[PDB]
Amino acid sequence: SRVSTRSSLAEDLRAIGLADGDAVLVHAALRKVGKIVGGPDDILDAMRDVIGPAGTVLGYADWQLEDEIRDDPAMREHIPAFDPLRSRSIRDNGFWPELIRTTPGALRSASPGASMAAIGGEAEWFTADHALDYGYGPRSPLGKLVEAKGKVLMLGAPLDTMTLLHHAEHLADFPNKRILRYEAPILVDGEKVWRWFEEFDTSDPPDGLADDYFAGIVEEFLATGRGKRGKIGEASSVLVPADEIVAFAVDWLERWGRTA
Amino acid sequence: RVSTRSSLAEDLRAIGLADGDAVLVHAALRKVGKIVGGPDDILDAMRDVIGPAGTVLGYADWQLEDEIRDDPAMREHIPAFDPLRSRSIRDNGFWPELIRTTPGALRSASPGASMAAIGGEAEWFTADHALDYGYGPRSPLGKLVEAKGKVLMLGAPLDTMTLLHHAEHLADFPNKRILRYEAPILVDGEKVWRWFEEFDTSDPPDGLADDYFAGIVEEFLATGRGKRGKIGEASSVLVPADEIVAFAVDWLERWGRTA
Ligand SMILES: CC(C)(COP(=O)(O)OP(=O)(O)OC[C@H]1O[C@@H](n2cnc3c(N)ncnc32)[C@H](O)[C@@H]1OP(=O)(O)O)[C@@H](O)C(=O)NCCC(=O)NCCS
Numbered sequence: 270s271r272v273s274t275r276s277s278l279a280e281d282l283r284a285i286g287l288a289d290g291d292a293v294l295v296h297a298a299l300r301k302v303g304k305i306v307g308g309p310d311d312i313l314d315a316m317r318d319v320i321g322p323a324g325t326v327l328g329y330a331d332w333q334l335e336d337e338i339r340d341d342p343a344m345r346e347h348i349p350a351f352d353p354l355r356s357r358s359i360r361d362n363g364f365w366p367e368l369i370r371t372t373p374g375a376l377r378s379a380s381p382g383a384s385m386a387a388i389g390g391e392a393e394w395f396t397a398d399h400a401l402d403y404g405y406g407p408r409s410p411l412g413k414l415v416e417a418k419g420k421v422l423m424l425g426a427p428l429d430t431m432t433l434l435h436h437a438e439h440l441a442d443f444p445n446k447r448i449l450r451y452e453a454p455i456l457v458d459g460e461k462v463w464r465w466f467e468e469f470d471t472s473d474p475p476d477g478l479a480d481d482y483f484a485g486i487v488e489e490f491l492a493t494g495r496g497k498r499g500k501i502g503e504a505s506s507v508l509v510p511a512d513e514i515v516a517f518a519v520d521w522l523e524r525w526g527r528t529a
Numbered sequence: 530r531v532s533t534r535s536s537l538a539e540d541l542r543a544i545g546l547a548d549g550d551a552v553l554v555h556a557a558l559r560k561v562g563k564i565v566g567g568p569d570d571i572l573d574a575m576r577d578v579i580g581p582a583g584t585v586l587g588y589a590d591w592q593l594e595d596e597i598r599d600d601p602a603m604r605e606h607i608p609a610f611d612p613l614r615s616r617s618i619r620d621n622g623f624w625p626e627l628i629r630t631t632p633g634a635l636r637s638a639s640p641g642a643s644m645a646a647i648g649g650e651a652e653w654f655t656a657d658h659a660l661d662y663g664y665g666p667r668s669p670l671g672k673l674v675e676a677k678g679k680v681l682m683l684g685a686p687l688d689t690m691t692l693l694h695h696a697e698h699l700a701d702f703p704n705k706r707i708l709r710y711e712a713p714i715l716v717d718g719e720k721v722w723r724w725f726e727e728f729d730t731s732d733p734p735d736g737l738a739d740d741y742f743a744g745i746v747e748e749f750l751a752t753g754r755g756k757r758g759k760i761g762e763a764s765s766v767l768v769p770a771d772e773i774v775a776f777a778v779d780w781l782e783r784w785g786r787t788a
Pocket residue numbers: 295296297298299300301308309329361362363364365426427429430431432616619
Protein backbone atom coordinates (compact mmCIF):
# COMPACT_ATOMS: atom_id res chain seq x y z
CA SER A 270 0.00 0.00 0.00
CA ARG A 271 3.01 2.18 -0.77
CA VAL A 272 3.08 4.40 -3.84
CA SER A 273 5.98 4.52 -6.26
CA THR A 274 7.42 7.61 -7.94
CA ARG A 275 9.69 8.16 -10.97
CA SER A 276 12.25 8.89 -8.34
CA SER A 277 11.47 5.92 -6.10
CA LEU A 278 11.55 3.54 -9.04
CA ALA A 279 15.01 4.72 -10.14
CA GLU A 280 16.39 3.72 -6.73
CA ASP A 281 14.88 0.22 -6.95
CA LEU A 282 16.35 -0.17 -10.42
CA ARG A 283 19.78 0.88 -9.22
CA ALA A 284 19.49 -1.54 -6.31
CA ILE A 285 18.52 -4.47 -8.56
CA GLY A 286 21.71 -3.73 -10.51
CA LEU A 287 20.70 -1.61 -13.51
CA ALA A 288 23.41 0.99 -14.25
CA ASP A 289 24.71 3.56 -16.76
CA GLY A 290 24.69 2.69 -20.43
CA ASP A 291 23.50 -0.91 -20.61
CA ALA A 292 20.67 -2.49 -22.60
CA VAL A 293 17.82 -4.16 -20.74
CA LEU A 294 15.07 -6.29 -22.25
CA VAL A 295 12.07 -6.01 -19.95
CA HIS A 296 9.24 -8.46 -19.32
CA ALA A 297 6.58 -7.20 -16.95
CA ALA A 298 3.36 -7.78 -15.07
CA LEU A 299 2.65 -4.12 -14.40
CA ARG A 300 -0.07 -4.64 -11.75
CA LYS A 301 2.57 -6.23 -9.52
CA VAL A 302 4.32 -2.84 -9.21
CA GLY A 303 1.28 -1.55 -7.34
CA LYS A 304 0.34 2.13 -7.41
CA ILE A 305 2.49 4.63 -9.32
CA VAL A 306 2.00 8.41 -9.17
CA GLY A 307 2.42 8.90 -12.92
CA GLY A 308 1.42 5.44 -14.12
CA PRO A 309 3.71 2.90 -15.79
CA ASP A 310 5.34 5.65 -17.87
CA ASP A 311 7.08 6.56 -14.60
CA ILE A 312 8.87 3.21 -14.87
CA LEU A 313 10.26 3.81 -18.36
CA ASP A 314 11.35 7.29 -17.30
CA ALA A 315 12.94 5.89 -14.14
CA MET A 316 14.89 3.37 -16.20
CA ARG A 317 16.08 5.88 -18.76
CA ASP A 318 17.35 8.07 -15.93
CA VAL A 319 19.36 5.21 -14.49
CA ILE A 320 20.87 3.91 -17.74
CA GLY A 321 21.21 7.36 -19.32
CA PRO A 322 20.47 8.37 -22.93
CA ALA A 323 22.97 5.81 -24.30
CA GLY A 324 21.23 2.85 -22.67
CA THR A 325 18.38 1.06 -24.42
CA VAL A 326 15.16 -0.44 -23.06
CA LEU A 327 13.58 -3.35 -24.93
CA GLY A 328 10.13 -4.93 -25.00
CA TYR A 329 8.65 -7.99 -26.72
CA ALA A 330 6.10 -6.63 -29.20
CA ASP A 331 5.34 -9.72 -31.31
CA TRP A 332 2.26 -9.16 -33.46
CA GLN A 333 -1.49 -9.47 -33.18
CA LEU A 334 -2.55 -11.75 -36.07
CA GLU A 335 -4.01 -14.78 -34.26
CA ASP A 336 -3.16 -17.43 -36.90
CA GLU A 337 -6.23 -16.05 -38.72
CA ILE A 338 -5.09 -17.38 -42.10
CA ARG A 339 -4.99 -20.91 -40.79
CA ASP A 340 -8.15 -20.16 -38.84
CA ASP A 341 -9.83 -19.04 -42.07
CA PRO A 342 -8.69 -18.88 -45.69
CA ALA A 343 -10.92 -16.52 -47.74
CA MET A 344 -10.24 -14.12 -44.88
CA ARG A 345 -6.94 -13.70 -46.64
CA GLU A 346 -7.37 -10.44 -48.51
CA HIS A 347 -8.71 -8.69 -45.41
CA ILE A 348 -5.65 -9.26 -43.21
CA PRO A 349 -3.51 -6.11 -43.10
CA ALA A 350 0.16 -6.91 -43.55
CA PHE A 351 2.64 -6.55 -40.71
CA ASP A 352 3.72 -2.91 -40.46
CA PRO A 353 6.49 -2.19 -37.90
CA LEU A 354 5.24 1.40 -37.58
CA ARG A 355 1.55 0.52 -37.37
CA SER A 356 1.06 -3.12 -36.27
CA ARG A 357 0.10 -3.12 -32.60
CA SER A 358 1.77 -5.39 -30.05
CA ILE A 359 0.33 -8.75 -29.09
CA ARG A 360 -1.84 -8.35 -26.03
CA ASP A 361 -0.58 -11.54 -24.38
CA ASN A 362 2.70 -9.78 -23.59
CA GLY A 363 0.85 -7.19 -21.51
CA PHE A 364 0.92 -3.42 -21.81
CA TRP A 365 4.70 -3.02 -21.49
CA PRO A 366 5.89 -3.57 -25.07
CA GLU A 367 3.07 -1.32 -26.30
CA LEU A 368 4.05 1.27 -23.69
CA ILE A 369 7.49 1.41 -25.25
CA ARG A 370 6.42 1.12 -28.90
CA THR A 371 4.10 4.14 -28.57
CA THR A 372 6.58 6.27 -26.63
CA PRO A 373 8.01 8.92 -28.97
CA GLY A 374 11.54 8.09 -30.09
CA ALA A 375 10.90 4.33 -30.08
CA LEU A 376 11.63 1.94 -32.97
CA ARG A 377 10.48 -1.55 -33.90
CA SER A 378 12.17 -4.56 -35.49
CA ALA A 379 11.17 -6.12 -38.84
CA SER A 380 10.55 -9.84 -38.12
CA PRO A 381 6.80 -9.94 -37.27
CA GLY A 382 6.34 -12.64 -34.60
CA ALA A 383 9.76 -12.07 -33.08
CA SER A 384 9.60 -8.26 -33.39
CA MET A 385 10.99 -6.16 -30.55
CA ALA A 386 10.26 -2.58 -29.59
CA ALA A 387 13.27 -0.60 -28.35
CA ILE A 388 13.97 2.91 -27.04
CA GLY A 389 17.21 4.77 -26.41
CA GLY A 390 20.71 5.41 -27.72
CA GLU A 391 21.16 2.13 -29.57
CA ALA A 392 17.52 1.47 -30.45
CA GLU A 393 18.42 1.69 -34.17
CA TRP A 394 21.14 -0.95 -33.91
CA PHE A 395 18.93 -3.42 -32.01
CA THR A 396 15.95 -3.19 -34.39
CA ALA A 397 18.08 -3.16 -37.53
CA ASP A 398 18.49 -6.31 -39.64
CA HIS A 399 16.06 -8.53 -37.81
CA ALA A 400 16.03 -11.66 -39.96
CA LEU A 401 12.63 -12.80 -41.22
CA ASP A 402 13.52 -16.49 -40.96
CA TYR A 403 14.82 -17.82 -37.63
CA GLY A 404 14.18 -14.45 -36.04
CA TYR A 405 15.27 -15.80 -32.67
CA GLY A 406 18.83 -16.47 -33.79
CA PRO A 407 22.08 -14.45 -34.19
CA ARG A 408 20.55 -11.76 -36.42
CA SER A 409 17.98 -10.43 -34.00
CA PRO A 410 17.74 -8.06 -31.04
CA LEU A 411 18.20 -11.14 -28.83
CA GLY A 412 21.49 -12.13 -30.46
CA LYS A 413 22.54 -8.48 -30.21
CA LEU A 414 21.62 -8.31 -26.53
CA VAL A 415 24.16 -11.11 -25.98
CA GLU A 416 26.90 -9.38 -27.98
CA ALA A 417 26.49 -6.16 -26.02
CA LYS A 418 26.40 -8.00 -22.68
CA GLY A 419 22.97 -6.52 -22.07
CA LYS A 420 20.52 -7.52 -19.37
CA VAL A 421 17.10 -9.06 -18.90
CA LEU A 422 14.75 -7.80 -16.21
CA MET A 423 11.72 -9.81 -15.15
CA LEU A 424 9.57 -7.01 -13.76
CA GLY A 425 7.03 -9.07 -11.84
CA ALA A 426 6.40 -11.29 -14.87
CA PRO A 427 6.32 -15.13 -14.64
CA LEU A 428 9.82 -16.54 -15.15
CA ASP A 429 8.97 -18.78 -18.13
CA THR A 430 8.32 -15.63 -20.14
CA MET A 431 12.03 -14.96 -20.65
CA THR A 432 12.05 -14.73 -24.45
CA LEU A 433 15.87 -14.62 -24.54
CA LEU A 434 15.92 -18.36 -23.83
CA HIS A 435 14.42 -19.01 -27.26
CA HIS A 436 17.74 -17.72 -28.59
CA ALA A 437 19.34 -20.49 -26.54
CA GLU A 438 17.02 -23.08 -28.10
CA HIS A 439 18.13 -21.88 -31.52
CA LEU A 440 21.81 -22.15 -30.59
CA ALA A 441 21.81 -25.39 -28.61
CA ASP A 442 22.88 -28.66 -30.22
CA PHE A 443 20.12 -31.13 -29.35
CA PRO A 444 18.16 -33.72 -31.35
CA ASN A 445 14.86 -33.29 -33.21
CA LYS A 446 14.30 -29.54 -33.11
CA ARG A 447 10.74 -28.88 -34.27
CA ILE A 448 10.50 -26.56 -37.28
CA LEU A 449 7.64 -24.11 -37.72
CA ARG A 450 6.41 -23.15 -41.17
CA TYR A 451 3.68 -20.62 -41.85
CA GLU A 452 2.88 -17.81 -44.27
CA ALA A 453 2.18 -14.23 -43.19
CA PRO A 454 1.50 -10.89 -44.93
CA ILE A 455 4.31 -8.31 -44.84
CA LEU A 456 5.49 -5.33 -46.90
CA VAL A 457 7.73 -5.63 -49.96
CA ASP A 458 8.52 -2.47 -51.93
CA GLY A 459 5.75 -0.55 -50.17
CA GLU A 460 3.12 -3.19 -50.96
CA LYS A 461 1.43 -6.14 -49.22
CA VAL A 462 2.91 -9.54 -50.06
CA TRP A 463 2.29 -13.00 -48.58
CA ARG A 464 5.49 -14.78 -47.60
CA TRP A 465 6.51 -18.21 -46.28
CA PHE A 466 8.35 -18.16 -42.95
CA GLU A 467 10.72 -20.71 -41.40
CA GLU A 468 11.89 -20.92 -37.79
CA PHE A 469 12.30 -23.23 -34.81
CA ASP A 470 9.01 -23.46 -32.91
CA THR A 471 8.90 -21.19 -29.85
CA SER A 472 5.16 -21.55 -29.26
CA ASP A 473 5.59 -25.06 -27.89
CA PRO A 474 8.06 -26.82 -25.61
CA PRO A 475 10.38 -29.33 -27.25
CA ASP A 476 10.28 -33.14 -26.64
CA GLY A 477 7.94 -33.28 -23.66
CA LEU A 478 9.53 -30.62 -21.50
CA ALA A 479 6.78 -28.74 -19.68
CA ASP A 480 5.49 -25.49 -21.16
CA ASP A 481 7.05 -23.66 -18.23
CA TYR A 482 10.48 -25.27 -18.41
CA PHE A 483 12.04 -21.83 -19.03
CA ALA A 484 11.17 -21.07 -15.40
CA GLY A 485 13.20 -23.90 -13.88
CA ILE A 486 16.24 -22.82 -15.86
CA VAL A 487 16.08 -19.20 -14.69
CA GLU A 488 15.53 -20.55 -11.17
CA GLU A 489 18.56 -22.83 -11.49
CA PHE A 490 20.69 -20.01 -12.93
CA LEU A 491 19.77 -17.75 -10.01
CA ALA A 492 20.95 -20.42 -7.56
CA THR A 493 24.46 -20.02 -8.98
CA GLY A 494 24.37 -16.55 -7.46
CA ARG A 495 25.14 -14.70 -10.68
CA GLY A 496 21.72 -13.14 -11.13
CA LYS A 497 20.09 -10.77 -8.65
CA ARG A 498 16.69 -10.38 -7.02
CA GLY A 499 14.89 -7.29 -5.83
CA LYS A 500 11.65 -5.41 -5.54
CA ILE A 501 10.77 -2.77 -8.07
CA GLY A 502 7.85 -0.86 -6.65
CA GLU A 503 5.82 -3.66 -5.11
CA ALA A 504 6.82 -6.22 -7.75
CA SER A 505 9.27 -9.05 -7.02
CA SER A 506 11.83 -8.91 -9.81
CA VAL A 507 14.83 -10.59 -11.42
CA LEU A 508 17.75 -8.93 -13.22
CA VAL A 509 20.05 -11.27 -15.17
CA PRO A 510 23.08 -10.94 -17.48
CA ALA A 511 21.89 -11.82 -21.01
CA ASP A 512 25.04 -13.58 -22.24
CA GLU A 513 25.53 -15.56 -19.03
CA ILE A 514 22.06 -17.10 -19.02
CA VAL A 515 22.06 -17.87 -22.74
CA ALA A 516 25.34 -19.76 -22.44
CA PHE A 517 23.95 -21.38 -19.30
CA ALA A 518 20.68 -22.40 -20.97
CA VAL A 519 22.50 -23.76 -24.01
CA ASP A 520 24.40 -26.18 -21.77
CA TRP A 521 21.21 -27.11 -19.89
CA LEU A 522 19.59 -27.98 -23.21
CA GLU A 523 22.67 -29.60 -24.78
CA ARG A 524 22.96 -31.94 -21.79
CA TRP A 525 19.26 -32.73 -21.60
CA GLY A 526 19.25 -33.83 -25.24
CA ARG A 527 22.25 -36.13 -24.79
CA THR A 528 20.85 -37.42 -21.54
CA ALA A 529 17.68 -37.66 -23.63
CA ARG B 530 -20.08 -12.29 -37.77
CA VAL B 531 -16.77 -10.69 -38.66
CA SER B 532 -16.13 -7.18 -39.89
CA THR B 533 -13.41 -5.94 -42.22
CA ARG B 534 -11.91 -2.69 -43.42
CA SER B 535 -14.21 -3.03 -46.43
CA SER B 536 -17.24 -4.07 -44.39
CA LEU B 537 -16.81 -1.31 -41.82
CA ALA B 538 -16.46 1.14 -44.71
CA GLU B 539 -19.91 0.31 -46.09
CA ASP B 540 -21.52 0.55 -42.65
CA LEU B 541 -19.86 3.94 -42.19
CA ARG B 542 -21.13 4.99 -45.61
CA ALA B 543 -24.59 3.68 -44.72
CA ILE B 544 -24.79 5.82 -41.58
CA GLY B 545 -23.72 8.96 -43.46
CA LEU B 546 -20.01 9.83 -43.53
CA ALA B 547 -18.74 11.35 -46.76
CA ASP B 548 -15.76 12.95 -48.46
CA GLY B 549 -14.33 15.79 -46.38
CA ASP B 550 -16.19 15.30 -43.09
CA ALA B 551 -14.85 16.12 -39.66
CA VAL B 552 -16.12 13.59 -37.12
CA LEU B 553 -15.71 13.39 -33.36
CA VAL B 554 -16.16 9.74 -32.43
CA HIS B 555 -17.15 8.31 -29.05
CA ALA B 556 -16.91 4.53 -28.92
CA ALA B 557 -17.56 1.34 -27.00
CA LEU B 558 -15.25 -0.77 -29.15
CA ARG B 559 -16.21 -4.08 -27.57
CA LYS B 560 -19.74 -4.19 -29.00
CA VAL B 561 -18.57 -3.67 -32.58
CA GLY B 562 -17.86 -7.38 -32.17
CA LYS B 563 -15.07 -9.26 -33.92
CA ILE B 564 -12.87 -7.36 -36.34
CA VAL B 565 -10.22 -9.09 -38.50
CA GLY B 566 -7.40 -6.54 -38.16
CA GLY B 567 -8.43 -5.14 -34.79
CA PRO B 568 -10.09 -1.78 -34.06
CA ASP B 569 -7.44 -0.09 -36.26
CA ASP B 570 -9.70 -1.32 -39.09
CA ILE B 571 -12.36 1.12 -37.91
CA LEU B 572 -10.01 4.09 -38.12
CA ASP B 573 -8.67 2.78 -41.42
CA ALA B 574 -12.20 2.34 -42.79
CA MET B 575 -13.26 5.80 -41.60
CA ARG B 576 -10.33 7.49 -43.30
CA ASP B 577 -11.08 5.64 -46.54
CA VAL B 578 -14.64 6.98 -46.46
CA ILE B 579 -13.89 10.59 -45.49
CA GLY B 580 -10.60 10.72 -47.39
CA PRO B 581 -7.22 12.27 -46.56
CA ALA B 582 -8.91 15.67 -46.27
CA GLY B 583 -11.47 14.51 -43.71
CA THR B 584 -10.54 14.42 -40.02
CA VAL B 585 -11.32 11.94 -37.22
CA LEU B 586 -11.32 13.02 -33.58
CA GLY B 587 -11.34 11.41 -30.15
CA TYR B 588 -11.73 12.80 -26.64
CA ALA B 589 -8.37 12.27 -24.95
CA ASP B 590 -8.49 14.26 -21.70
CA TRP B 591 -5.72 12.95 -19.39
CA GLN B 592 -4.79 10.78 -16.43
CA LEU B 593 -4.60 13.14 -13.39
CA GLU B 594 -7.28 11.98 -10.85
CA ASP B 595 -6.90 15.09 -8.68
CA GLU B 596 -3.97 13.16 -7.33
CA ILE B 597 -2.77 16.68 -6.97
CA ARG B 598 -5.63 17.02 -4.66
CA ASP B 599 -5.67 13.32 -3.88
CA ASP B 600 -2.61 13.89 -1.75
CA PRO B 601 -0.32 16.92 -1.92
CA ALA B 602 3.04 15.56 -0.78
CA MET B 603 2.88 13.79 -4.12
CA ARG B 604 2.37 17.18 -5.76
CA GLU B 605 5.94 17.10 -6.99
CA HIS B 606 5.99 13.56 -8.38
CA ILE B 607 3.25 14.47 -10.81
CA PRO B 608 4.64 14.86 -14.34
CA ALA B 609 3.34 17.87 -16.25
CA PHE B 610 0.82 17.45 -19.06
CA ASP B 611 2.73 16.83 -22.28
CA PRO B 612 0.51 16.72 -25.40
CA LEU B 613 2.98 14.32 -26.99
CA ARG B 614 3.51 11.97 -24.03
CA SER B 615 0.48 12.05 -21.72
CA ARG B 616 -1.79 9.01 -22.20
CA SER B 617 -5.51 9.65 -22.58
CA ILE B 618 -7.93 8.89 -19.76
CA ARG B 619 -8.87 5.21 -19.60
CA ASP B 620 -12.51 6.03 -18.83
CA ASN B 621 -12.95 7.14 -22.45
CA GLY B 622 -11.92 3.69 -23.65
CA PHE B 623 -9.21 2.68 -26.12
CA TRP B 624 -10.52 4.76 -29.03
CA PRO B 625 -8.79 8.08 -28.20
CA GLU B 626 -5.47 6.31 -27.40
CA LEU B 627 -5.91 4.40 -30.65
CA ILE B 628 -6.04 7.68 -32.56
CA ARG B 629 -3.35 9.39 -30.46
CA THR B 630 -0.83 6.56 -30.96
CA THR B 631 -1.44 6.33 -34.71
CA PRO B 632 1.46 7.90 -36.59
CA GLY B 633 0.60 11.37 -37.87
CA ALA B 634 -1.91 12.01 -35.10
CA LEU B 635 -1.96 15.21 -33.06
CA ARG B 636 -3.18 16.42 -29.66
CA SER B 637 -4.18 19.82 -28.25
CA ALA B 638 -2.99 21.75 -25.19
CA SER B 639 -5.96 22.09 -22.80
CA PRO B 640 -5.29 19.06 -20.54
CA GLY B 641 -8.80 18.10 -19.37
CA ALA B 642 -10.46 19.07 -22.65
CA SER B 643 -7.58 17.65 -24.72
CA MET B 644 -8.60 16.17 -28.09
CA ALA B 645 -6.80 13.68 -30.33
CA ALA B 646 -7.06 14.16 -34.10
CA ILE B 647 -5.86 12.60 -37.36
CA GLY B 648 -6.23 13.63 -40.99
CA GLY B 649 -6.34 16.64 -43.27
CA GLU B 650 -7.21 19.33 -40.75
CA ALA B 651 -5.87 17.70 -37.58
CA GLU B 652 -3.41 20.59 -37.27
CA TRP B 653 -6.28 23.07 -37.44
CA PHE B 654 -8.50 21.29 -34.91
CA THR B 655 -5.77 20.85 -32.29
CA ALA B 656 -4.18 24.28 -32.67
CA ASP B 657 -4.73 27.18 -30.25
CA HIS B 658 -6.85 25.25 -27.75
CA ALA B 659 -7.59 27.72 -24.94
CA LEU B 660 -6.35 26.66 -21.51
CA ASP B 661 -9.13 28.43 -19.61
CA TYR B 662 -12.61 27.42 -20.79
CA GLY B 663 -11.41 24.63 -23.07
CA TYR B 664 -14.97 23.78 -24.13
CA GLY B 665 -15.75 27.20 -25.58
CA PRO B 666 -15.26 28.62 -29.11
CA ARG B 667 -11.45 28.31 -29.21
CA SER B 668 -11.42 24.54 -28.81
CA PRO B 669 -11.67 21.59 -31.20
CA LEU B 670 -15.37 21.35 -30.26
CA GLY B 671 -15.99 24.91 -31.38
CA LYS B 672 -14.13 24.30 -34.63
CA LEU B 673 -16.19 21.17 -35.26
CA VAL B 674 -19.26 23.40 -35.42
CA GLU B 675 -17.48 26.01 -37.57
CA ALA B 676 -16.60 23.19 -39.97
CA LYS B 677 -20.10 21.67 -39.86
CA GLY B 678 -18.58 18.46 -38.57
CA LYS B 679 -20.28 15.42 -37.09
CA VAL B 680 -20.47 13.25 -34.00
CA LEU B 681 -20.59 9.48 -34.22
CA MET B 682 -21.54 7.47 -31.16
CA LEU B 683 -19.90 4.14 -32.01
CA GLY B 684 -21.78 1.85 -29.63
CA ALA B 685 -21.16 4.43 -26.92
CA PRO B 686 -23.82 5.44 -24.37
CA LEU B 687 -25.40 8.71 -25.49
CA ASP B 688 -24.65 10.98 -22.51
CA THR B 689 -20.97 10.81 -23.44
CA MET B 690 -21.47 13.32 -26.24
CA THR B 691 -18.79 15.75 -25.07
CA LEU B 692 -19.84 18.15 -27.84
CA LEU B 693 -22.81 19.17 -25.68
CA HIS B 694 -20.51 20.59 -22.98
CA HIS B 695 -19.76 23.17 -25.67
CA ALA B 696 -23.46 24.00 -25.64
CA GLU B 697 -23.40 24.37 -21.86
CA HIS B 698 -20.64 26.89 -22.43
CA LEU B 699 -22.53 28.84 -25.12
CA ALA B 700 -26.00 28.64 -23.58
CA ASP B 701 -27.18 31.51 -21.39
CA PHE B 702 -28.85 30.18 -18.24
CA PRO B 703 -28.47 31.26 -14.60
CA ASN B 704 -25.95 30.06 -12.01
CA LYS B 705 -23.46 28.12 -14.09
CA ARG B 706 -21.08 26.32 -11.79
CA ILE B 707 -17.61 27.74 -12.41
CA LEU B 708 -14.72 25.41 -11.66
CA ARG B 709 -11.25 26.32 -10.45
CA TYR B 710 -8.44 23.82 -10.29
CA GLU B 711 -4.65 23.77 -10.35
CA ALA B 712 -2.66 21.55 -12.74
CA PRO B 713 0.94 20.94 -13.88
CA ILE B 714 1.63 21.89 -17.50
CA LEU B 715 4.71 22.74 -19.56
CA VAL B 716 5.85 26.36 -19.57
CA ASP B 717 9.15 26.93 -21.37
CA GLY B 718 9.49 23.15 -21.68
CA GLU B 719 9.51 23.06 -17.87
CA LYS B 720 6.87 21.73 -15.43
CA VAL B 721 4.84 24.63 -13.98
CA TRP B 722 1.67 24.45 -11.87
CA ARG B 723 -1.14 26.71 -13.06
CA TRP B 724 -4.64 27.71 -11.96
CA PHE B 725 -7.36 26.92 -14.50
CA GLU B 726 -10.99 27.91 -14.78
CA GLU B 727 -13.77 26.22 -16.74
CA PHE B 728 -17.51 25.87 -16.52
CA ASP B 729 -18.01 22.52 -14.76
CA THR B 730 -18.22 19.46 -17.02
CA SER B 731 -17.98 16.91 -14.21
CA ASP B 732 -21.41 17.69 -12.76
CA PRO B 733 -24.61 18.90 -14.48
CA PRO B 734 -26.24 22.27 -13.87
CA ASP B 735 -28.00 22.18 -10.48
CA GLY B 736 -31.24 20.59 -11.58
CA LEU B 737 -30.66 18.02 -14.34
CA ALA B 738 -29.40 14.45 -13.83
CA ASP B 739 -25.82 13.42 -14.66
CA ASP B 740 -26.97 11.73 -17.87
CA TYR B 741 -29.36 14.37 -19.21
CA PHE B 742 -27.15 14.62 -22.32
CA ALA B 743 -28.82 11.31 -23.26
CA GLY B 744 -32.29 12.83 -23.06
CA ILE B 745 -31.29 15.69 -25.35
CA VAL B 746 -29.67 13.49 -28.01
CA GLU B 747 -32.71 11.20 -28.07
CA GLU B 748 -35.00 14.18 -28.51
CA PHE B 749 -32.83 15.53 -31.32
CA LEU B 750 -33.10 12.11 -32.98
CA ALA B 751 -36.89 12.27 -32.62
CA THR B 752 -36.86 15.42 -34.77
CA GLY B 753 -35.51 13.32 -37.62
CA ARG B 754 -32.26 15.09 -38.47
CA GLY B 755 -30.07 12.35 -37.04
CA LYS B 756 -29.40 8.91 -38.48
CA ARG B 757 -29.30 5.57 -36.70
CA GLY B 758 -27.46 2.49 -37.90
CA LYS B 759 -25.16 -0.44 -37.26
CA ILE B 760 -21.41 -0.10 -37.46
CA GLY B 761 -20.24 -3.68 -37.18
CA GLU B 762 -22.49 -5.07 -34.45
CA ALA B 763 -22.66 -1.77 -32.57
CA SER B 764 -25.82 0.32 -32.57
CA SER B 765 -24.69 3.79 -33.60
CA VAL B 766 -25.91 7.33 -34.20
CA LEU B 767 -24.40 10.05 -36.38
CA VAL B 768 -25.37 13.69 -35.84
CA PRO B 769 -24.47 17.05 -37.32
CA ALA B 770 -22.37 18.99 -34.80
CA ASP B 771 -23.79 22.38 -35.77
CA GLU B 772 -27.40 21.27 -35.43
CA ILE B 773 -27.12 19.32 -32.19
CA VAL B 774 -25.43 22.23 -30.40
CA ALA B 775 -28.00 24.74 -31.66
CA PHE B 776 -30.73 22.34 -30.55
CA ALA B 777 -29.10 21.76 -27.14
CA VAL B 778 -28.49 25.47 -26.51
CA ASP B 779 -32.19 26.28 -26.98
CA TRP B 780 -33.25 23.34 -24.80
CA LEU B 781 -30.87 24.62 -22.12
CA GLU B 782 -31.78 28.30 -22.44
CA ARG B 783 -35.51 27.49 -22.38
CA TRP B 784 -35.14 25.53 -19.14
CA GLY B 785 -33.35 28.38 -17.35
CA ARG B 786 -36.18 30.77 -18.25
CA THR B 787 -38.31 28.68 -15.94
CA ALA B 788 -37.11 31.11 -13.27
C1 LIG C 1 0.04 -11.66 -18.68
C2 LIG C 1 0.61 -10.50 -17.97
C3 LIG C 1 1.04 -9.53 -19.03
C4 LIG C 1 -0.48 -9.92 -17.11
O1 LIG C 1 -0.15 -8.62 -16.78
P1 LIG C 1 -0.90 -7.93 -15.81
O2 LIG C 1 -0.23 -7.92 -14.59
O3 LIG C 1 -2.24 -8.34 -15.82
O4 LIG C 1 -0.83 -6.49 -16.28
P2 LIG C 1 -0.36 -5.77 -17.58
O5 LIG C 1 1.02 -5.71 -17.72
O6 LIG C 1 -1.12 -6.06 -18.70
O7 LIG C 1 -0.69 -4.40 -17.23
C5 LIG C 1 -1.89 -4.03 -16.57
C6 LIG C 1 -1.81 -2.67 -15.90
O8 LIG C 1 -1.34 -1.83 -16.86
C7 LIG C 1 -1.67 -0.52 -16.54
N1 LIG C 1 -2.10 0.15 -17.75
C8 LIG C 1 -2.56 -0.44 -18.82
N2 LIG C 1 -2.83 0.46 -19.72
C9 LIG C 1 -2.55 1.61 -19.21
C10 LIG C 1 -2.65 2.81 -19.70
N3 LIG C 1 -3.11 2.88 -20.91
N4 LIG C 1 -2.32 3.89 -19.04
C11 LIG C 1 -1.86 3.76 -17.79
N5 LIG C 1 -1.76 2.49 -17.29
C12 LIG C 1 -2.11 1.43 -18.01
C13 LIG C 1 -2.74 -0.63 -15.59
O9 LIG C 1 -2.13 -0.46 -14.37
C14 LIG C 1 -3.15 -2.05 -15.77
O10 LIG C 1 -3.89 -2.49 -14.65
P3 LIG C 1 -5.38 -2.40 -14.64
O11 LIG C 1 -5.73 -3.47 -15.47
O12 LIG C 1 -5.70 -2.56 -13.27
O13 LIG C 1 -5.60 -1.11 -15.14
C15 LIG C 1 1.76 -10.95 -17.11
O14 LIG C 1 1.31 -12.01 -16.33
C16 LIG C 1 2.85 -11.47 -17.96
O15 LIG C 1 2.74 -12.72 -18.40
N6 LIG C 1 3.82 -10.65 -18.22
C17 LIG C 1 4.93 -11.05 -19.04
C18 LIG C 1 4.37 -11.32 -20.41
C19 LIG C 1 5.50 -11.37 -21.35
O16 LIG C 1 6.40 -10.57 -21.25
N7 LIG C 1 5.46 -12.30 -22.25
C20 LIG C 1 6.55 -12.42 -23.21
C21 LIG C 1 6.29 -13.56 -24.14
S1 LIG C 1 5.92 -15.05 -23.23
